[PDB]
Write a protein that binds this ligand. Structure first.
Ligand SMILES: CC(=O)N[C@@H]1[C@@H](O)[C@H](O)[C@@H](CO)O[C@H]1O
Ligand SMILES: CC(=O)N[C@@H]1[C@@H](O)[C@H](O)[C@@H](CO)O[C@H]1O
Lengths: 286, 286
């Protein structure tokens, strides 16, 4: 009993102690260090030792969910995009090799998917999870219940989909939070800089907010269409902080998916994840 | 806009940036430093500068909610219980003077009540708020909308109520959330040390868990009865971490309050707070 879980993303580092029965205690959310004067490895070390002293844990099982391409066996970040500077090469097993030899590392979306499936039951046999946020990532659980990470650990890096040579942009470069916030300013949305306010303003009938959301949702849908064509999944789950919007998110994306598929093509239902925040923390220990 | 809000408790320090429209962003929640080799002052300073850098805020309006007797004018902790060691004398106005002259400091319950009333409207003219958690605190907003803190700032230190000389224990020593954890252990509840698990177990028919909850609720009700008698409030709000149990906590307490009142005595409705986690973060800026 008493596992330590840490979920690292470009915006926040989340942590908690989880028991054998899936009960979460001592949740701790902090703004991600810049990885320049403040180090993610130092913050991760501090979180582990804090939980160790707090609960007198000897060689505890530590689970690590992280953005970036993850080599599970190595416990290492083999490639990272630009969101987290100087991240490539980060090895968590070596970092904590004095506190515990029991360290697991997974990609953020694999963790989110395993977590969501640990907490909620679905009829669908094939489930693809796509998270929207700082970055766009993916994970697929097949009919035999297996998640394939790829020959080089980079399966489902869906942010790399749909490179437009004339715009020099990937899916991620048009649909991640930093891109949407730039689209809000370009769209004429001066009201706020926060995505929830954009959603709120659109619910109130602000035409401006709606045009930004619909155009952005057009690109999200295009990416989902490619995922659908390839996997033919029973269910597509949308994860990430924006998952909080629920049906107010689905209503903008879901209908648009049909624009990139043939008229009689049946695609999977598109839904937000039921677990809106702690999914990856449970997933990294699975 | 952009106000910095920090809520310091014996268990955790929560922080967030809040805008003019009451939108909460960059929420953070860390375990409370031990205040020995790790200082709360340093962490608060660290949290404020971090938000200043992230948003390029100059002399930002800073709000501080804290457990302990608070001298609002001085912005200082005048007395603290045995929860946070070396807390007495902590002065937040002085500590943050190098960053902003706009600092406000309040007791955690005053902040909770002001916070809950800022996000939720009630018909009741007089509202008492009691929080259950690491300790037990209280606050009273009268029919004139004013909260009287007392001649020596210790008004509504409700944890000192009902001292029992045969047991050498106060209300706070029998009804504090951590007193409930001690009671679960002494009552033979080995299944877990997590209070929500005691609630789950009782819902599923665990008689030992039901007994621990009813005995504990009896002492909570007793304290509420004294508060009701003095104030005759229009509403009693229950805040604190245990407030997340909502109606499942109320069903244990409300009926029992009548046991310490006369047969035809009408007491106020007792409800959990609506803003469960962040009430104090909104309240400390009022
Ligand atoms: C190369 C890289 O960094 N890819 C990450 C991916 O691992 C992660 O799943 C996703 C969501 O956080 O964000 C991408 O940018
Ligand atoms: C003397 C003292 O510290 N009293 C605190 C009180 O200020 C606080 O409101 C309450 C809830 O946290 O806990 C009590 O123990």
């Amino acid at each position: 009993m008493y596992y330590i879980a840490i979920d690292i993303g470009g915006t926040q580092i989340k942590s908690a102690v989880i028991d054998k029965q899936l009960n979460m205690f001592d949740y701790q959310q902090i703004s991600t260090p810049d990885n320049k004067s403040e180090l993610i490895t130092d913050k991760v070390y501090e979180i582990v030792t804090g939980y160790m002293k707090q609960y007198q844990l000897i060689q505890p099982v530590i689970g690590i969910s992280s953005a970036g391409v993850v080599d599970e066996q190595k416990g290492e970040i083999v490639y990272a995009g630009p969101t987290i500077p100087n991240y490539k090469g980060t090895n968590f097993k070596r970092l904590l090799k004095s506190l515990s030899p029991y360290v697991k590392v997974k990609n953020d979306v694999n963790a989110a998917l395993l977590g969501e499936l640990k907490l909620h039951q679905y009829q669908a046999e094939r489930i693809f999870c796509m998270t929207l946020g700082t970055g766009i990532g993916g994970a697929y659980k097949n009919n035999q219940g297996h998640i394939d990470n790829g020959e080089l650990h980079k399966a489902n890096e869906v942010g790399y989909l749909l490179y437009r040579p004339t715009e020099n942009t990937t899916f991620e470069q048009r649909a991640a939070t930093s891109a949407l916030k730039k689209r809000m300013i370009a769209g004429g949305f001066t009201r706020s800089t926060h995505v929830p306010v954009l959603f709120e303003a659109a619910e109130e009938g602000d035409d401006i907010a709606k045009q930004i959301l619909n155009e952005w949702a057009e690109d999200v849908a295009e990416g989902i269409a490619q995922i659908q064509v390839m996997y033919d999944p029973g269910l597509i789950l949308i994860g990430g902080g924006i998952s909080e919007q629920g049906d107010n998110l689905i209503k903008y994306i879901e209908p648009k998916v049909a624009h990139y598929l043939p008229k009689d093509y049946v695609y999977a239902p598109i839904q937000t994840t039921k677990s809106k925040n702690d999914a990856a923390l449970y997933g990294c220990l699975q």
